[PDB]
Short mmCIF file of C-alpha atoms (C1' of nucleotides) in Angstrom, two decimals:
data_model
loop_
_atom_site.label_atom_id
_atom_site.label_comp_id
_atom_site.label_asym_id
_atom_site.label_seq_id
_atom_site.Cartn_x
_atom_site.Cartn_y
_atom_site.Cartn_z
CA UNK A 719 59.96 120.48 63.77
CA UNK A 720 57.68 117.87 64.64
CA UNK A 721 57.87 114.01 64.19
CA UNK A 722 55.15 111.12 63.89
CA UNK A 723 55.94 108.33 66.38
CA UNK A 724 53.46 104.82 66.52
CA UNK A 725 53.65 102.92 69.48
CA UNK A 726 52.05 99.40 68.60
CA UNK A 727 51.11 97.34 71.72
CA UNK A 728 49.84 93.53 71.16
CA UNK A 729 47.34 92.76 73.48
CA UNK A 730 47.83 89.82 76.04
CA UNK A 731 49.98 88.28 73.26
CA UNK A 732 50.93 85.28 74.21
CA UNK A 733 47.63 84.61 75.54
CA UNK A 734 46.49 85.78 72.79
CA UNK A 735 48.43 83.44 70.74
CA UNK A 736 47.12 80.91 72.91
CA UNK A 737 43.62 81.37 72.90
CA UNK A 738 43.64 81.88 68.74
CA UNK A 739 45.45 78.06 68.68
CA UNK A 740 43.08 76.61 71.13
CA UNK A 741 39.71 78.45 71.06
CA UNK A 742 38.77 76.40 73.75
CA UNK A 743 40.50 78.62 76.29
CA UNK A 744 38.79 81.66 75.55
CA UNK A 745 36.52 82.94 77.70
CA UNK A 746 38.25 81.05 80.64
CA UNK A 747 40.91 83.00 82.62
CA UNK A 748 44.56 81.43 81.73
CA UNK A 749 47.45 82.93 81.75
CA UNK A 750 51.19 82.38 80.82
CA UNK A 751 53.57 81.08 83.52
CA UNK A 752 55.20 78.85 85.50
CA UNK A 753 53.61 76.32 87.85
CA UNK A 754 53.54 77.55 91.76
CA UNK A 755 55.50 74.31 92.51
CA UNK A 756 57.96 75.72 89.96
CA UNK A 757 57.33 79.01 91.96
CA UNK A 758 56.74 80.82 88.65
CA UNK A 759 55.76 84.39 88.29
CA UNK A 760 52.75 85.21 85.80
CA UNK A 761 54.26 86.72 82.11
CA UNK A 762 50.93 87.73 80.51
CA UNK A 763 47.07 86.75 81.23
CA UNK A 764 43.77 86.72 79.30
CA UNK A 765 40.86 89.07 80.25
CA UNK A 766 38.74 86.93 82.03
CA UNK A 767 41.49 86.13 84.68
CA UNK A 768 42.96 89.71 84.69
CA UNK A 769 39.00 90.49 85.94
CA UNK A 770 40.03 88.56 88.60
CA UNK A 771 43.35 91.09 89.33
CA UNK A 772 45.69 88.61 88.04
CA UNK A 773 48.52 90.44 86.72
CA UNK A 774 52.07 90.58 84.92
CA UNK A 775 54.65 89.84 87.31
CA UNK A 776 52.68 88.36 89.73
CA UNK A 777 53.81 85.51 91.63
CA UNK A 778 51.69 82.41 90.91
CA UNK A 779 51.17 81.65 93.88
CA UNK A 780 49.05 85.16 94.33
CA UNK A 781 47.44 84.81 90.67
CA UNK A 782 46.35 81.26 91.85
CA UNK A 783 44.87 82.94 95.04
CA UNK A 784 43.24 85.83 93.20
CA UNK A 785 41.88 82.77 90.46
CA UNK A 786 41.65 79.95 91.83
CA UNK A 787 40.76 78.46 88.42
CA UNK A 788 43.22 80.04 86.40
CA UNK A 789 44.43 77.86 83.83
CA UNK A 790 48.68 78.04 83.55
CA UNK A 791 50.54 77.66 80.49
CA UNK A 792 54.26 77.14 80.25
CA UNK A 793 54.63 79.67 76.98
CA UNK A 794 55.74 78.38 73.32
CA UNK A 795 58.37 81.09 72.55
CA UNK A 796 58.72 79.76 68.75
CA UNK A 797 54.54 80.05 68.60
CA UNK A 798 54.74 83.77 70.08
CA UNK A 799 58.61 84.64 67.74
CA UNK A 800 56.97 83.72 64.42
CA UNK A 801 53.78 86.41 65.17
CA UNK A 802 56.31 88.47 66.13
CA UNK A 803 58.41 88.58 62.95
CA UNK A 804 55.58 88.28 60.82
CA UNK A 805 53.96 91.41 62.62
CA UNK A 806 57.33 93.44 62.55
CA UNK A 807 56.90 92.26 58.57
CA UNK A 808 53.79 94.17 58.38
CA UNK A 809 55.47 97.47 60.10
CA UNK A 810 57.89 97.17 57.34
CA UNK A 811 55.59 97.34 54.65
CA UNK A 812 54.83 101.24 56.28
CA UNK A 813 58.69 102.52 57.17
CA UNK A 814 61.46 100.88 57.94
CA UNK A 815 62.07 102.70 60.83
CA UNK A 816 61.33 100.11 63.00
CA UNK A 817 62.66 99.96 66.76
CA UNK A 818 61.25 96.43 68.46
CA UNK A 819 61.20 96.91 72.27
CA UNK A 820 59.93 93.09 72.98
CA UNK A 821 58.17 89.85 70.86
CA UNK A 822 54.92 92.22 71.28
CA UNK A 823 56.03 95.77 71.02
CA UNK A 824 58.08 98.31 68.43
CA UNK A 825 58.23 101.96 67.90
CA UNK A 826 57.70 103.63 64.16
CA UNK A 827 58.82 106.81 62.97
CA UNK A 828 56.10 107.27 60.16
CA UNK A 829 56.78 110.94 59.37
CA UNK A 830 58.39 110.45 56.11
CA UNK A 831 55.97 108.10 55.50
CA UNK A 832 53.18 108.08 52.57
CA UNK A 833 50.55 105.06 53.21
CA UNK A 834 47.48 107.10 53.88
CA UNK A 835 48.12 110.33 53.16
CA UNK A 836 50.64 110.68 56.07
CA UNK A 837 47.98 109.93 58.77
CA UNK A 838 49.57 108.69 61.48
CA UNK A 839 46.43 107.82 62.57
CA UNK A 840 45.13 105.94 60.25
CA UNK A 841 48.42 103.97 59.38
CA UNK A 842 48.26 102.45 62.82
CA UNK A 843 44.24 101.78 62.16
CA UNK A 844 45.49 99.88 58.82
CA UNK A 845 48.76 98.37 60.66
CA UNK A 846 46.00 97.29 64.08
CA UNK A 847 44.02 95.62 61.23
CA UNK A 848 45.96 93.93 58.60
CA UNK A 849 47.46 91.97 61.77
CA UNK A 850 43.82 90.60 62.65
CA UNK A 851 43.31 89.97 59.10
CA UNK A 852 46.60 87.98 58.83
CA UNK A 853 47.43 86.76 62.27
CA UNK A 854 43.98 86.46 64.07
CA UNK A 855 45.30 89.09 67.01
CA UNK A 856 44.51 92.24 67.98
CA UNK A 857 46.65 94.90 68.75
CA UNK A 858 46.21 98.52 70.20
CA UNK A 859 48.68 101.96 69.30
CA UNK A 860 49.37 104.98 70.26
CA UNK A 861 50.12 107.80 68.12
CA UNK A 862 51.99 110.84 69.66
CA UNK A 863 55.09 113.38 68.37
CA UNK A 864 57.37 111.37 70.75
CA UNK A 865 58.44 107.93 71.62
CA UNK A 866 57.23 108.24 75.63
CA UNK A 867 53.94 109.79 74.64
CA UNK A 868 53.10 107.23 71.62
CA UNK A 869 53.87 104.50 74.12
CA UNK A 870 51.43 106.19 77.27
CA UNK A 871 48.86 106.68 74.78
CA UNK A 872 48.87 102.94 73.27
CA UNK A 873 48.20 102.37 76.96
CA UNK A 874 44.80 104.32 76.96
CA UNK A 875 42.09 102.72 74.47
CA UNK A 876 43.14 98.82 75.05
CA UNK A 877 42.24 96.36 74.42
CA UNK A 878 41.81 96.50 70.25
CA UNK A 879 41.71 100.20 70.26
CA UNK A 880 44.16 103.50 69.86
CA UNK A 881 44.78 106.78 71.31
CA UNK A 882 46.32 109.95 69.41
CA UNK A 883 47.65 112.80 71.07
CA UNK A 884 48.40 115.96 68.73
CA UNK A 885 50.88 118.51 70.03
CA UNK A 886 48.13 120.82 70.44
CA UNK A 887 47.10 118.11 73.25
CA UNK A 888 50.48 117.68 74.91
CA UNK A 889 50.60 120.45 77.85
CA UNK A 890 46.75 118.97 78.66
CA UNK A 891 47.84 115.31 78.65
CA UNK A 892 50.47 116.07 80.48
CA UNK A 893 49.95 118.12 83.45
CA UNK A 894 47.99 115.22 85.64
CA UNK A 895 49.82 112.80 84.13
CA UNK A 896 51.21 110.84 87.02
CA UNK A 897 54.77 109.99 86.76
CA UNK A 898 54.79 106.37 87.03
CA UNK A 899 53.84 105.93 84.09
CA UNK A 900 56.42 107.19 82.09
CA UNK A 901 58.48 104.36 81.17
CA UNK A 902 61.91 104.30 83.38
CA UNK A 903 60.09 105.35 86.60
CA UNK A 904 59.20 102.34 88.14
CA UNK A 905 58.30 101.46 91.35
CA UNK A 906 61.51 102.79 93.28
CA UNK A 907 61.74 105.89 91.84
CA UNK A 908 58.01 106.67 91.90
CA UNK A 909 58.39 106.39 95.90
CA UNK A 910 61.18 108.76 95.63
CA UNK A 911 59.24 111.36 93.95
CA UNK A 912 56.41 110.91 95.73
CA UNK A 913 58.17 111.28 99.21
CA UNK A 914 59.10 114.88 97.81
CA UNK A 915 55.36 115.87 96.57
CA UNK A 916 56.49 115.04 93.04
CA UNK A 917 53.04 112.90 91.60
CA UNK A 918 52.65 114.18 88.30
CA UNK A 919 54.58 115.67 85.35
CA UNK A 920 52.63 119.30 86.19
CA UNK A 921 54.53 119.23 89.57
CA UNK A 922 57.74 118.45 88.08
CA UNK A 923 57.43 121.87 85.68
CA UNK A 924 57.47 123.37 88.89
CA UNK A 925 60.91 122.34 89.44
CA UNK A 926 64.04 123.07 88.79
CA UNK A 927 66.67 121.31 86.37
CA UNK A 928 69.40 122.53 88.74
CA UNK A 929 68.18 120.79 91.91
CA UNK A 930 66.56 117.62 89.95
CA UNK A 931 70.43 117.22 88.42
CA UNK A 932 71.62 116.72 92.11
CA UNK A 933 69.16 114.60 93.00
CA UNK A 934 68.63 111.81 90.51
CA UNK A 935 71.89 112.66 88.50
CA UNK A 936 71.10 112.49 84.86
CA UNK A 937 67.89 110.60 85.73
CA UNK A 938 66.77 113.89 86.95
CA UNK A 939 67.22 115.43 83.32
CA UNK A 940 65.10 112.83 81.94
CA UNK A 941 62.17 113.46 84.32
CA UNK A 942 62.52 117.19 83.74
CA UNK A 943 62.37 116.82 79.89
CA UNK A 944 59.62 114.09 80.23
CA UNK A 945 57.45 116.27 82.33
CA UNK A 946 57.47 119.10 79.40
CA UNK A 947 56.35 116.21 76.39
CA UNK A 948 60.74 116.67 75.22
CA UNK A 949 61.74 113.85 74.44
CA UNK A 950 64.50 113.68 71.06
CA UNK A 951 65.12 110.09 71.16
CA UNK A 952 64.76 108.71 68.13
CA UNK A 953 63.51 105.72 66.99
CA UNK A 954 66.66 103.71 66.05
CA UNK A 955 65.88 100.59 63.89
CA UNK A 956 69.66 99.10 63.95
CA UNK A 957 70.28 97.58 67.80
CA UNK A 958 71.50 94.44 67.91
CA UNK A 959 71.66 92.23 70.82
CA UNK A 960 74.27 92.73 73.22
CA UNK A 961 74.31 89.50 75.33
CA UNK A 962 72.98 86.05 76.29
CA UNK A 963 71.47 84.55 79.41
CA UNK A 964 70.25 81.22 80.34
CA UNK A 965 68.87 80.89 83.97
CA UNK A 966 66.71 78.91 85.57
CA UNK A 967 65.27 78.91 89.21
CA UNK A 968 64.81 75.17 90.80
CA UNK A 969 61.46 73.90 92.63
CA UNK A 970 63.36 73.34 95.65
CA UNK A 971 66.55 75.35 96.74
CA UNK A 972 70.16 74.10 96.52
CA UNK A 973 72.28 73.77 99.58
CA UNK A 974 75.41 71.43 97.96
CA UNK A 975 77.54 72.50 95.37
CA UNK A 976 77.00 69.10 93.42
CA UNK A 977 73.60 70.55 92.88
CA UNK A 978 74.60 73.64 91.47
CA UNK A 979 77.49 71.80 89.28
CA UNK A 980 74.61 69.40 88.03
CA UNK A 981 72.67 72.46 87.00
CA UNK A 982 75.19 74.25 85.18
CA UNK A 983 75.73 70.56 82.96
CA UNK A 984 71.84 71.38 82.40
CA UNK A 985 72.29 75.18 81.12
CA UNK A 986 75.95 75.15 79.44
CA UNK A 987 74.40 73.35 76.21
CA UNK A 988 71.16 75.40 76.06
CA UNK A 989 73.63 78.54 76.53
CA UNK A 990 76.04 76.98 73.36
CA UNK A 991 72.93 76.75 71.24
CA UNK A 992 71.46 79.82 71.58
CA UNK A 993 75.01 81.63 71.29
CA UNK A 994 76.16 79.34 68.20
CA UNK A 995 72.59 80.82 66.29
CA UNK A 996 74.13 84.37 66.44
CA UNK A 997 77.93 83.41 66.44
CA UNK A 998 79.05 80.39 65.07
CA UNK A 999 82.32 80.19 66.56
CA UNK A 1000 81.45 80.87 69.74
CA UNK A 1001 83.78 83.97 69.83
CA UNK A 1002 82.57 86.22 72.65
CA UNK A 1003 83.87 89.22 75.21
CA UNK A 1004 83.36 88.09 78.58
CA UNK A 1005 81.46 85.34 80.38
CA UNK A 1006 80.09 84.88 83.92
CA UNK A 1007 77.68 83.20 85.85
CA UNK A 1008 74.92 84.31 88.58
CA UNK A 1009 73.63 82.66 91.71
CA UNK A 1010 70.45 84.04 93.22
CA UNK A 1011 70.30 82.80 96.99
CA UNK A 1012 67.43 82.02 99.73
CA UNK A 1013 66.72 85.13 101.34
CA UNK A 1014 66.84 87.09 97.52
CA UNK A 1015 70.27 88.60 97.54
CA UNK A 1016 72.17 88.24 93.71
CA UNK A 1017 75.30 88.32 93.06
CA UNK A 1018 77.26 88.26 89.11
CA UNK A 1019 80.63 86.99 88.19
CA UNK A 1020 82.05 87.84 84.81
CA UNK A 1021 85.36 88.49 82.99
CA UNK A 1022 86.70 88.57 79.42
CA UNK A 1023 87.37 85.62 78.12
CA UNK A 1024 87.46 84.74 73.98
CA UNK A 1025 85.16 81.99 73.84
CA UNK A 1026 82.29 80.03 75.59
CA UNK A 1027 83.73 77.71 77.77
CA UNK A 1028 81.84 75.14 80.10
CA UNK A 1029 84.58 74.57 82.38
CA UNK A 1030 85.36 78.47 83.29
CA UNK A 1031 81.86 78.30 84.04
CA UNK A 1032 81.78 75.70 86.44
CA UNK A 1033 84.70 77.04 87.76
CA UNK A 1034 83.54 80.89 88.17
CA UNK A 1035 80.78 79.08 90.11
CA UNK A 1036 82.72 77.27 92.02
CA UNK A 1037 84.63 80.51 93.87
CA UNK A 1038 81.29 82.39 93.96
CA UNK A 1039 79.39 79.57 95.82
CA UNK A 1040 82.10 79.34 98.21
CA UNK A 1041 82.90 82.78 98.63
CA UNK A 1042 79.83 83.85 99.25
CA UNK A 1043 77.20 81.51 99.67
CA UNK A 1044 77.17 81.73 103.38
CA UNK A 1045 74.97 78.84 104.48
CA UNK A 1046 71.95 79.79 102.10
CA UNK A 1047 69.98 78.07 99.85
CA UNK A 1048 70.18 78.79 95.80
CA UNK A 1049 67.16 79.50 94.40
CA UNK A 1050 68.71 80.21 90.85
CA UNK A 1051 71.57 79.68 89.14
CA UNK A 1052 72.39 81.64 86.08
CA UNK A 1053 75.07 81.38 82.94
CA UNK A 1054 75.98 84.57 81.03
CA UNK A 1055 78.02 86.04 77.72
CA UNK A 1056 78.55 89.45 76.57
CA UNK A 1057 78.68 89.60 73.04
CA UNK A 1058 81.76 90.77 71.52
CA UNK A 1059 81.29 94.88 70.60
CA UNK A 1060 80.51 95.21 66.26
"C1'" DT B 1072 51.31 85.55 97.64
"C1'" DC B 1073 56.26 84.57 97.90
"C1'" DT B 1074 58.40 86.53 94.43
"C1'" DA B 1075 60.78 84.34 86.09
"C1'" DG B 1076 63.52 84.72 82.14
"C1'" DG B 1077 64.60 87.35 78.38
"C1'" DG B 1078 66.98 91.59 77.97
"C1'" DT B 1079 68.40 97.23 78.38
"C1'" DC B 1080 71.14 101.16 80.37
"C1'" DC B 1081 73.58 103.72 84.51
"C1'" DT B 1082 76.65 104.25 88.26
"C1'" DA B 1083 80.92 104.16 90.60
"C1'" DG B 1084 85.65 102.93 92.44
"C1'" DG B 1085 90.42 101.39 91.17
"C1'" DA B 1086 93.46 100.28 87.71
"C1'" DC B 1087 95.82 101.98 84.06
"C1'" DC B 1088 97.40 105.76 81.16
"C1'" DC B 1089 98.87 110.34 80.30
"C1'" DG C 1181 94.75 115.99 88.20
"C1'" DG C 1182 91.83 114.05 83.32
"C1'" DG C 1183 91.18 110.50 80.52
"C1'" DT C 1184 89.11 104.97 79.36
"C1'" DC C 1185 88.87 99.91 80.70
"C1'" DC C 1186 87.20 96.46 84.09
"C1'" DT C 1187 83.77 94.72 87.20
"C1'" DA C 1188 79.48 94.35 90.41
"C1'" DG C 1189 75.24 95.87 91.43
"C1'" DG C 1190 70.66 97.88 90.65
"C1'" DA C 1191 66.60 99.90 88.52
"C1'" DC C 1192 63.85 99.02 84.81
"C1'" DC C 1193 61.86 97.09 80.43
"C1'" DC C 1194 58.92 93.31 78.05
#
DNA sequence: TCTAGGGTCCTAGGACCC
DNA sequence: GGGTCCTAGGACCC
């Protein structure tokens, strides 16, 4: 058989969102972030300041460098959460086979689908529109018999624009394809494969399951089924959050634990709210904490326990800043809960 | 340039159980 | 010796 898979990919969507509620940030480069005296990292950036290589993940310090007028923006998560629900609201109108990755991304199975006459194609054309005739914001997709493939391909015509690969296209597509860009090789593994002469997805054919088993484990499986166009997940529609995390990284570093207690009284209530929105009663599997130190070294600390609890907190923290603190500053301080299992 | 905050899944050693 | 929990860490995703 053969299934019908939609990647849809806003595009710079919280900029987007930005630049659509203040049009007078549009053709200047801004970009969503925290400050460089908060020692933010870039989340997403308009055109004009990716032009000037500012980039996702990118410390704002460098973006600053790279832009020196870049405009930063601290990010209005309720102002990017209601596109996103009313976007995933036009998806549903198509299939309910729905699988959101993030506020700006979802995979749809569209093969039992009837909307325009089964055309893949042009169900993502009518699902990229529809959103600019609703929402103001553009949106690219990829269409493609696989999840992996739908999502490379909603990479290739962006911004505003799609990218359908037919199975008849697969071995082509595939055999330069370099293997970065399949999601789950990032930047660690890539270096791994490359130290071995393994670039693309065409080398990888000329492997062997066997040896790629011993050396990446069942990682190894994955890049040999990737590198043929196999891929059988399917596109789920009922995941449900598994746990909660509130963190936050301080201008300066903290070197006494009064400090880190003090931030902790800042997080525990931001941590209760968000956890009392999905579970009332507080009633979770395990809870921890996280300190991320000077030098960049992280370390976690969690256990079951039946229900959110400031004081285990402060206490878990406690033992892991003096166990293991050793002299350094703390850059971050984190709070945790893992949701119990239904 | 100096490195976020949401999250996901995988691995692996001991404990615990058969 | 074969089978799940617990826990810490890490790569990776947006």
């Amino acid at each position: 058989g053969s299934r019908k898979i939609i990647h849809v990919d806003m595009d710079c969507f919280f900029a987007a969102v930005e630049m659509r509620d203040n049009p007078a940030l549009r053709d200047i480069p801004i970009a969503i972030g925290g400050s460089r005296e908060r020692r933010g990292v870039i989340s997403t950036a308009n055109y004009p300041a990716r032009k000037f290589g500012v980039r996702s993940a990118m410390p704002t310090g460098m973006a600053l460098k790279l832009c020196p007028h870049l405009t930063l923006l601290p990010g209005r998560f309720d102002a990017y959460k209601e596109a996103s629900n009313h976007i995933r609201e036009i998806f549903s109108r198509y299939t309910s086979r729905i699988e959101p990755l993030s506020l700006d991304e979802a995979y749809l199975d569209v093969t039992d689908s009837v909307h325009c006459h089964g055309s893949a194609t042009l169900i993502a054309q009518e699902i990229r529109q529809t959103i600019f005739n609703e929402l103001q914001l553009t949106a690219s997709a990829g269409v493609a018999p696989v999840k992996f493939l739908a999502k490379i391909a909603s990479d290739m015509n962006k911004p505003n624009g799609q990218f359908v690969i037919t199975p008849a296209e697969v071995p082509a597509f595939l055999q330069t394809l370099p293997l970065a860009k399949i999601p789950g090789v990032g930047k660690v593994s890539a270096a791994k494969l490359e130290a071995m002469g393994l670039r693309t997805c065409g080398d990888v054919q000329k492997c062997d399951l066997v040896m790629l088993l011993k050396r990446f484990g069942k990682f190894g499986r994955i890049l040999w089924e990737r590198s043929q166009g196999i891929d059988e997940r399917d596109v789920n529609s009922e995941r449900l959050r598994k746990s909660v995390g509130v963190e936050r990284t301080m201008a300066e570093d903290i070197h006494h634990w009064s400090e880190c207690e003090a931030i902790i009284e800042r997080l525990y209530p931001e941590l209760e709210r968000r956890l009392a929105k999905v579970k009332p009663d507080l009633l979770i599997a395990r809870q921890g904490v996280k300190l991320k130190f000077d030098d960049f070294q992280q370390t976690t600390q969690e256990h079951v326990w039946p229900r959110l609890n400031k004081a285990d907190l402060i206490a878990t923290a406690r033992k892991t800043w003096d166990e293991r603190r050793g002299g350094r500053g703390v850059r971050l301080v984190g709070l945790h809960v893992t949701l119990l299992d239904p």
